[PDB]
Design a binder for these strands. Structure first.
Ligand code: NA
Length: 51
DNA sequence: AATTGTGAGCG
DNA sequence: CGCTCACAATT
């Protein structure tokens, strides 16, 4: 499968890789609108854990 | 005083 | 390259 990364979903949402990692694991500091971006980025794109 | 970004340490 | 963990320059 296409190795869709944390970055791809982050840029797609308009957020940082670390902000989007903190939507997956190590979760601190996530906002109303920013969260809803990450969700639409994860579900429209076929993100792969660890690739 | 809140977050992103950067650092670095694991794989 | 890809990611969790942890910490801090900037705002
Ligand atoms: Na992950």
């Amino acid at each position: 499968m296409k190795p869709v990364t944390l970055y791809d979903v982050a840029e797609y949402a308009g957020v940082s890789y670390q902000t989007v990692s903190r939507v997956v694991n190590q979760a601190s500091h996530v906002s109303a609108k920013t969260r809803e971006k990450v969700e639409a980025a994860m579900a429209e794109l076929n993100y792969i854990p660890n690739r």
